[PDB]
Write a protein that binds this DNA or RNA. Structure first.
Ligand SMILES: [Mg+2]
Ligand SMILES: [Mg+2]
Ligand SMILES: [Mg+2]
Ligand SMILES: [Mg+2]
Ligand SMILES: [Mg+2]
Ligand SMILES: [Mg+2]
Ligand SMILES: [Mg+2]
Ligand SMILES: [Mg+2]
Ligand SMILES: [Mg+2]
Ligand SMILES: [Mg+2]
Ligand SMILES: [Mg+2]
Ligand SMILES: [Mg+2]
Ligand SMILES: [Mg+2]
Ligand SMILES: [Mg+2]
Ligand SMILES: [Mg+2]
Ligand SMILES: [Mg+2]
Ligand SMILES: [Mg+2]
Ligand SMILES: [Mg+2]
Ligand SMILES: [Mg+2]
Ligand SMILES: [Mg+2]
Ligand SMILES: [Mg+2]
Ligand SMILES: [Mg+2]
Ligand SMILES: [Mg+2]
Ligand SMILES: [Mg+2]
Ligand SMILES: [Mg+2]
Ligand SMILES: [Mg+2]
Ligand SMILES: [Mg+2]
Ligand SMILES: [Mg+2]
Ligand SMILES: [Mg+2]
Ligand SMILES: [Mg+2]
Ligand SMILES: [Mg+2]
Ligand SMILES: [Mg+2]
Ligand SMILES: [Mg+2]
Ligand SMILES: [Mg+2]
Ligand SMILES: [Mg+2]
Ligand SMILES: [Mg+2]
Ligand SMILES: [Mg+2]
Ligand SMILES: [Mg+2]
Ligand SMILES: [Mg+2]
Ligand SMILES: [Mg+2]
Ligand SMILES: [Mg+2]
Ligand SMILES: [Mg+2]
Ligand SMILES: [Mg+2]
Ligand SMILES: [Mg+2]
Ligand SMILES: [Mg+2]
Ligand SMILES: [Mg+2]
Ligand SMILES: [Mg+2]
Ligand SMILES: [Mg+2]
Ligand SMILES: [Mg+2]
Ligand SMILES: [Mg+2]
Ligand SMILES: [Mg+2]
Ligand SMILES: [Mg+2]
Ligand SMILES: [Mg+2]
Ligand SMILES: [Mg+2]
Ligand SMILES: [Mg+2]
Ligand SMILES: [Mg+2]
Ligand SMILES: [Mg+2]
Ligand SMILES: [Mg+2]
Lengths: 240, 122, 339, 393, 46
RNA sequence: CACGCUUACAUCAGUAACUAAUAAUAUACUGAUAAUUAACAACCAAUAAACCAAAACAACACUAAAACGUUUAUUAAUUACAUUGUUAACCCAACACAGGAGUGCACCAAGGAAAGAUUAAAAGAAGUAAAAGGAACUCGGCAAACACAAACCCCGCCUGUUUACCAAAAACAUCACCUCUAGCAUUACUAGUAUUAGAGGCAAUGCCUGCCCAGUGACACCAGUUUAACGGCCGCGGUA
RNA sequence: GUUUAAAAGAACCAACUCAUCUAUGUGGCAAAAUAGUGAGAAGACUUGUAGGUAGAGGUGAAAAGCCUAACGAGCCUGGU
RNA sequence: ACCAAAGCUAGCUCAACAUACUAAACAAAUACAAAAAUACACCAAAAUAAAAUAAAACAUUCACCUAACAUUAAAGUAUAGGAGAUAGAAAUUUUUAUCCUGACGC
């Protein structure tokens, strides 16, 4: 039998929704990814990755929201933050020093003068200084922050040429995009996430990581320190 | 293993298997979870008056029987409508367009007890 | 072990007789002999009490704007339950100046009252224990609409050895034909509060009849003589459970049979009609080995059903009965003995 | 952006029509004549089924705009279970009132006066707490949904036991689940406190004004705190079908017209299902304001004017062990402007009746260290409760 | 440990795995029913 | 009680024979006749909005971030009595099998009987007791014991998993440490985004992990780089 | 239940779950059991119900284990 | 003397003819967990035959192998084949209607 996905929820809500885990099984029922299953029961907190999202289309100008609480999220390694502006609240990915009772700005205006970059602020890449640390960057204007989200990770703006911004990802790779792509400034919360120490083999099971197979496999040619050069810059601008 | 030849009734299943024994439904489920019974769905037994009815369950043994003559549509027509239509044609007022005066029904959906849909059980 | 589950508000045809058999209770029509030695205390305001009762009735029937009720049937439970609560509260607050025990009494609203006892033996008919003697067990899980619990016990109505020519009706049949059904769960003896409560005595119970046992429903079922049988059964079950819980909280049981009669009062109310009952538990030794030489019987005095109002309309009570109000006033003005 | 619908879970699109439906002037041969699907024949397209006779249960739900009460202007309704983000601040803004911490001087004197106490106050209230928390149920540890209303009724009875000393508390009555609806336009925003509360005490005689004229006049110089990023309508139900009519919980000619005290209960066994203290204070403030507005508009009229005779309402919110007391004096009816006189509200918050309760005796190292009973007891909370109850007489 | 009791009865699993609806919902189960009918089995399914 | 078996349950009558691994007779065979009565259980509203704030006596907290809900607005046929499960000594193991069986109550107030009748041979199984000695037995102190303690090594850090039915381990996994592979969207990974996710090696921690790209692989589409990639890290002769 | 500021993949030890060693049993109570003795026993724990992954496969804390009492690859039918 | 032994039937098998080929029953219930009267849908899918065997092995090959053209000859011929095992036509020819159907079948 074919199973249905738990992600059948069209309406965005702030309350946590229940999610049905599936350990490596596709919709058929066979294992696709090994080492997944049997974790802790978790709820899902829907995150709004399109930071610049006005409430009503009548006023599409920049807007300011207020941070209510920075909470823990079991789904991602970062911390979430509830931000309220107008008549709705939303979950975003909290920055390094975002605390309760702060103000965050969300703007899409680009000017000849660069703006002073705070942490919770989210301006397009064309309005930020040339050496700014950023996170939750976008690929296309209005697509959504697919890129940097993990705890403590952050990219850096390198240069802006011909109305196109170049950023550098945590993987030390260069990514060229339009300057109108919104991006949040600062580092993502939980910078000490890599320093955490799993105390025992049971914490991995709590997180939902089944043990590795006991089959001994001889290393092939893939193994070894492959010193490969940095790949070329990944560009997302469509040149006609 | 289990049995396959025996009938699969409601007594042979879990608590969540409650199959009826063949009775007809008499209502629906209301608001607070109770059952609302509809008085139009329950069969109303139409019983006649057997007080002055001079007829018994058995007949006289010396009474004679009759030859089997199963009543047919042609016989019924000859008994109920052939004299009327014959008299009407002899009088000269016969109307082939209107046959409702002789007992014919164009559409069954008008009356209460229709014949082809069989709205009445018995 | 297994036990019968006795329901006070039951649908059985003649359940008062079966409950009398289960309880060793004799039912007497009319009120018990009144203690005519009462001082000239009842100088209360009958007009004020009438206005208060009519105020509660009109508030719960016409004045209170509730949510839009789509069913036109206008069910009588949601209109009489708050009426009963408000009537009890108002009567207690008003008569607390005459009866000083009502001010110190506790008012429980829909609190369960449980009692579990044994009555006779029975040979096990089926099973691997066939032919062996097993005692019949009963359990009452009642939920009175309103209870008034006091600190001191109400005075007795008749002596403990009160002899009555009427005998307890015995049933030449099995209790399964009532119908009663056996079940097995926690057998608890509850008075309405735990034994650590200082108010271990009861004053008056209030029982609202459900919509399944209405006069119209019984008349449609062609059960007119059971309109009083349901009231009698509710009283005999509920008040016996209450007095038995009180006695077993005091420390009396089958082999430690009760020494002082445990009395209780009950008001059973339909959507419109009222009935008043008085119960006096004299004996708690209902078991087989303890009912051999036990001449004592429990007594239940009953009053026929009488309507309080009559077809009220548009914030005006058409008919009103003061005798039922006087009965309620006396029931709430009964006081314990002073020393 | 990121659409929240997954294609494999959304309603799948209808299959493409057969190729015989694209040929002009050609009738399709379908299986509609045999009343069943059959392969090889075209798929018949059927018009929307018309049940010529309508059925109540088995009909499609009529739209919202079809309703006769549908209006274009959005009304922000506050019902019983509406939560507020900036609770007290939002309530003060929406009701145009000034907040004070301590209870009014009248109720404080009525509390601190030792002549208004019950016979055995300490023992009576301790027994009430113990009965509510442990004794009222046959279980070992009763739930909040059972011990909150029980303790509220026990305190209500402890207060009612004072009618033999004050023969004036008989002018009151109780009401449960009465529909209240008070709508007002404030700063071009049409708000409406509409729903039902837990318990409502009504009385024949009104409550006297408790605020002094000096305080009422100094209220003019007080400005309401504003929150810039958040809108004052955060947490309210934005509806379009509503009735702008001052409908109180009762009809005309009610013998107990004046509301004395509202009672709110947070009887929920789950922390997320319960209300926060701030949200509970906001809820009780908004509902007391709705009751006061209903009474004022039934007494004087629907015209917006400053009331020469203020309307005093009381409210008590109970978590089971935490009590919030509120005395709200409504003085004005014009609420669109933020320049005139504002109402007043004294809110005594975080009043602990008892710190903790042990339903079972704790044993550490084979010895009982804390017996059964409430640990820590503040009789001042019940003193304020009794003051609020006796404030009418 | 001890074998032989591999059959734990349950009517839900029985009717869901070898029931008439389970057989008829697949073209292979229809072939099973047709084979049982050709052989003349008194019981085609559970 | 749930799940499961369906009358094996109850009354009367019979058992020469059939079932009980034998009789007596009978819950287990035979025949006739009866039975399980609903309050417990099953079936027993949708459409939008307000809703971040765990359960653990929950006061308040920890991490692994946690099932269990009300209110408001629109429609929910409206009128007694609907339908179904109610026995048992019972199920799965070829059996009236010393086996396998979920849950709530108590350790008896409920369940039952180790011996068909004798005698007291050997050998066998179980137990109790034993002078003096106290491992001298034996592969081994296996088993047993009025003992139920203290140390030294090997292998695995540890808890844990494995060959259902001859091997429970020094095997596997394991926290930790290292390599590679990926710059990304509507069914796994993941409603995640390089502090991330996969393919692997070795095994916590401490000191370290030395030399080698000659060959074979892998990146590089040829050079060139890679050994915490597959793997290898020298002869012959004389000398104080 | 006991020890612990601890619900610490801590300790003693019940229910419960496994099966270390020995002795019976070996057409046996049993196609894997009994008795004594053992290991875990707040967790990577046991377990009820229901569903999914099906043999050129599934699943596997690799024993080439398990997939309805015979699995280096199930069973049945057909080729036969 | 027990145990036992012997029947001749039930019926089957192979053909011919043949109407032209999913029998009878179908009151109600039957693809809800079949035999359960009664609610706003979804319904349907195809992609070569393989191998056991023979070639004394086994790799190209291996008649029949659930696809109509029957019969007498051409003819086991031309042809196709690790040119091995084996496979194998066609052009062209012959074929007189019905009953005489039962059984050196159990
Ligand atoms: Mg995760
Ligand atoms: Mg996290
Ligand atoms: Mg690994
Ligand atoms: Mg390994
Ligand atoms: Mg079978
Ligand atoms: Mg069933
Ligand atoms: Mg069952
Ligand atoms: Mg009914
Ligand atoms: Mg088997
Ligand atoms: Mg069986
Ligand atoms: Mg025998
Ligand atoms: Mg029998
Ligand atoms: Mg039974
Ligand atoms: Mg012997
Ligand atoms: Mg014996
Ligand atoms: Mg013997
Ligand atoms: Mg011997
Ligand atoms: Mg021996
Ligand atoms: Mg010994
Ligand atoms: Mg010795
Ligand atoms: Mg030796
Ligand atoms: Mg030796
Ligand atoms: Mg030993
Ligand atoms: Mg030793
Ligand atoms: Mg020793
Ligand atoms: Mg180990
Ligand atoms: Mg260690
Ligand atoms: Mg495993
Ligand atoms: Mg083994
Ligand atoms: Mg094992
Ligand atoms: Mg072993
Ligand atoms: Mg081991
Ligand atoms: Mg290892
Ligand atoms: Mg290191
Ligand atoms: Mg190794
Ligand atoms: Mg090491
Ligand atoms: Mg090395
Ligand atoms: Mg190389
Ligand atoms: Mg090289
Ligand atoms: Mg442990
Ligand atoms: Mg054992
Ligand atoms: Mg021994
Ligand atoms: Mg043991
Ligand atoms: Mg142990
Ligand atoms: Mg240990
Ligand atoms: Mg399954
Ligand atoms: Mg092969
Ligand atoms: Mg495989
Ligand atoms: Mg191996
Ligand atoms: Mg091997
Ligand atoms: Mg097998
Ligand atoms: Mg060959
Ligand atoms: Mg050969
Ligand atoms: Mg060979
Ligand atoms: Mg061969
Ligand atoms: Mg072939
Ligand atoms: Mg050739
Ligand atoms: Mg050859």
């Amino acid at each position: 039998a074919t199973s249905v996905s738990w992600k059948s929820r069209t309406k965005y809500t702030v309350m946590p929704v229940k999610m049905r885990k599936s350990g490596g099984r596709n919709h058929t029922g066979q294992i696709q990814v090994h080492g997944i299953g049997g974790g802790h029961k978790q709820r899902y907190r829907m995150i709004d990755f399109l930071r610049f999202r006005p409430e009503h289309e009548s006023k599409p100008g920049p807007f300011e929201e207020k941070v209510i609480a920075v909470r823990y999220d079991p789904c991602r390694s970062a911390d979430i933050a509830l931000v309220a502006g107008g008549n709705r609240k939303r979950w975003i990915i909290a920055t390094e020093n975002m605390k309760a009772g702060d103000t965050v700005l969300n703007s899409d205006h680009i000017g000849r003068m660069a703006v002073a970059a705070r942490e919770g602020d989210a301006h397009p890449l064309g309005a930020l200084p040339v050496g700014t640390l950023i996170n939750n960057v976008e690929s296309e204007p209005g697509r959504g922050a697919q890129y940097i989200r993990a705890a403590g990770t952050c990219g850096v703006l390198l240069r802006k040429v011909n109305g196109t911004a170049i950023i550098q990802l945590p993987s030390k790779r260069q990514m060229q995009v339009l300057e109108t792509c919104i991006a949040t400034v600062g580092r993502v919360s939980n910078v000490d996430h890599n320093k955490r120490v799993i105390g025992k083999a049971g914490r991995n099971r709590w997180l939902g990581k089944r043990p590795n197979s006991g089959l001994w496999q001889r290393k092939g040619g893939w193994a070894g320190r492959k010193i490969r050069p940095l790949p070329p810059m990944k560009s997302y601008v469509k040149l006609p | 293993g289990a049995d396959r030849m025996s009938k699969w009734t409601s007594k042979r299943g879990p608590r969540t298997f409650c199959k009826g024994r063949g009775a007809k439904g008499t209502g629906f489920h209301g608001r607070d979870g109770k059952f609302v019974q509809i008085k139009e769905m329950i069969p109303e037994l139409v019983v006649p008056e057997l007080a002055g009815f001079k007829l018994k369950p058995y007949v006289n043994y010396r009474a004679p029987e009759g030859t089997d003559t199963p009543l047919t549509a042609k016989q019924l027509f000859l008994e109920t409508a052939a004299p009327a239509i014959e008299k009407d044609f002899k009088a000269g007022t016969f109307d082939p367009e209107h046959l409702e005066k002789y007992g014919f029904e164009p559409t069954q959906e008008g009356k209460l007890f229709q014949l082809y849909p069989k709205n009445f059980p018995r | 072990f297994m036990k019968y589950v006795v329901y006070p508000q039951t649908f059985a045809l003649n359940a008062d007789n079966w409950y009398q058999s289960f309880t060793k209770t004799v039912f007497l029509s009319g009120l018990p002999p009144t203690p005519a030695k009462l001082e000239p205390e009842p100088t209360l305001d009958i007009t004020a009490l009438r206005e208060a009762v009519c105020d509660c009735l009109l508030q719960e029937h016409f004045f209170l704007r509730r949510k839009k009720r789509a069913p036109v049937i206008q069910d009588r439970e949601a209109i009489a339950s708050p009426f009963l609560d408000q009537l009890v509260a108002s009567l207690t607050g008003l008569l607390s100046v005459h009866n000083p025990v009502l001010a110190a009494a506790a008012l429980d609203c829909k609190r369960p009252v449980h009692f579990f006892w044994l009555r006779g033996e029975e040979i096990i008919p089926r099973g691997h224990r066939k032919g062996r003697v097993d005692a019949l067990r009963y359990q009452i899980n009642d939920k009175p609409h309103n209870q008034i619990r006091i600190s001191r016990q109400l005075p007795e109505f008749v002596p403990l050895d009160y002899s009555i020519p009427i005998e307890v009706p015995v049933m030449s049949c099995k209790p399964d034909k009532l119908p009663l059904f056996k079940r097995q769960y926690e057998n608890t003896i509850f008075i309405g509060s735990k034994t650590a409560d200082p108010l271990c005595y009861g004053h008056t119970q209030f029982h609202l009849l459900p919509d399944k046992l209405k006069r119209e429903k019984l008349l449609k079922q062609n059960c007119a003589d059971q309109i009083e049988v349901v009231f009698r059964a509710n009283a005999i079950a509920s008040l016996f459970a209450w007095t038995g819980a009180q006695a077993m909280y005091q420390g009396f049981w089958s082999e430690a049979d009760v020494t002082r009669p445990f009395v209780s009062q009950g008001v059973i109310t339909d959507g419109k009609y009222f009935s008043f009952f008085c119960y006096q538990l004299n004996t708690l030794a209902l078991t087989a080995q303890a009912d051999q030489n036990n001449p004592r019987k429990n007594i239940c005095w009953g009053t026929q059903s009488k309507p309080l109002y009559e077809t009220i309309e548009d914030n005006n009570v058409k008919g009103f009965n003061d005798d039922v109000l006087l009965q309620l006033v006396q029931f709430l003005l009964n006081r314990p003995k002073e020393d | 952006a990121y659409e929240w619908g997954v294609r494999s879970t959304r309603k799948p699109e209808p299959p493409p029509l057969d190729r015989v439906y694209e040929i002009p002037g050609l009738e399709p041969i379908t299986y509609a004549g045999k009343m069943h699907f059959m392969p090889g024949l075209a798929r018949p397209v059927f018009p929307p089924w018309d049940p010529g006779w309508t059925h109540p249960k088995f009909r499609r739900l009529p739209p919202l705009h079809e309703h006769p009460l549908y209006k274009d202007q959005a009304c922000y309704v506050f019902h019983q279970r509406c939560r507020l983000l900036e609770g007290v601040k939002q309530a003060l803004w929406l009701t145009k009132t000034q907040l004070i911490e301590g209870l009014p001087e009248k109720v404080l004197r009525l509390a601190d006066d030792p002549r208004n106490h019950i016979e055995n106050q300490d023992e009576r209230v301790l027994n009430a707490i113990s009965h509510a928390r442990l004794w009222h149920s046959t279980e070992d540890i009763p739930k909040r949904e059972t011990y909150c209303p029980v303790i509220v009724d026990s305190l209500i009875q402890l207060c009612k036991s004072q009618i033999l000393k004050h023969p004036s508390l008989a002018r009151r009555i109780c009401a449960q689940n009465n529909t209240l609806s008070a709508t007002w336009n404030r700063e071009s925003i049409l708000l409406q406190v509409h729903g039902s509360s837990g318990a409502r005490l009504n009385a024949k005689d009104p409550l006297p004004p408790v605020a002094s004229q000096e305080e009422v006049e100094a209220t003019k110089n007080h400005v309401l705190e504003t929150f810039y990023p958040i809108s004052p309508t955060m947490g309210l139900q934005e509806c379009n079908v509503y009735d702008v009519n001052d409908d109180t919980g009762f009809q005309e000619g009610y013998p107990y017209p004046c509301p004395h005290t509202l009672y709110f209960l947070e009887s929920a066994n789950l922390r997320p299902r319960r209300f926060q203290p701030d949200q509970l204070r906001a809820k009780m403030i908004l509902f007391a304001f709705g009751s006061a507005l209903a009474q004022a508009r039934l007494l004087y009229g629907n015209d917006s004017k400053v009331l020469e005779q203020p309307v005093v309402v009381q409210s008590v919110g109970t978590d089971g062990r935490l009590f919030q007391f509120l005395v709200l004096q409504l003085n004005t009816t014009d609420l669109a402007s933020d320049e005139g006189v504002k109402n007043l509200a004294w809110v005594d918050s975080d009043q602990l009746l008892y710190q903790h309760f042990w339903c079972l005796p704790v044993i550490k190292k084979k010895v009982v260290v804390e017996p059964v009973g409430p640990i820590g007891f503040q009789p001042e909370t019940f003193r304020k409760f009794l003051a609020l109850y006796l404030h009418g007489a | 440990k001890a074998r032989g009791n591999e059959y734990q009865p349950s009517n839900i699993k029985r009717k869901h795995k070898h029931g008439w609806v389970r057989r008829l919902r697949t073209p292979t189960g229809v072939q099973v029913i047709l084979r049982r009918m050709h052989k003349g089995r008194k019981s085609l399914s559970h």
